[PDB]
Amino acid sequence: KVFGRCELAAAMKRHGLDNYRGYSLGNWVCAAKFESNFNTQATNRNTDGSTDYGILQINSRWWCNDGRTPGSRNLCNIPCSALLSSDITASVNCAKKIVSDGNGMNAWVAWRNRCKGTDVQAWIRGCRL
Template structure:
């Protein structure tokens, strides 16, 4: 019994590691393109890739704590204040648990990002997009990628 606990813990760590993913730039661009993000609500694919880089470094397990006690989750840093359900009261407008945004399957992240972009604020909901991507030449985010 004594040796079972460390092995179980190690297995749990390995499984958690397998579920998260750090995407490559072109790999993410292909996934986003395949899910209809290129041109969604007038935003180019490069906008989405740029935003994901500055929000999470393409890391699906990224979590950021905010001053108001809310947190941002996943590759698009989706806020628990409005969009997903965490430990604090939330509007949960994407009808999803924030923890579901932390795995390598980003289909639910994409659906929620589309919901956010469909609001009047559009991509301006992401502060790091406004700072690093809006009104910038974004060609470098998709240059060299094949689709």
């Protein structure tokens, strides 16, 4: 599934991401934009044998189990396939875990490089939230 910005902003808000650990809603929408282009099916391979999965490109090295990332962790206690669902619930809950574990949103490369210190509110303006 591919979200529009306002659609994703609404879903994320419903899932309690707005101001989660101090990060306003637009940060989460912006991160999803540059990580996955709002695509729940997005996957990207890493040089360490891990894979980044789903709307927020959560990786199999630390956060989920894909059965093909030797020696990795599964700190969100989920199959990586759950991060590829049309329903963003697993992705959102795992992202909360990543952030609340003390990693910040800085965990997300694309967010750090393209969202942090920008007008992230642009991502939600004009939406009917």
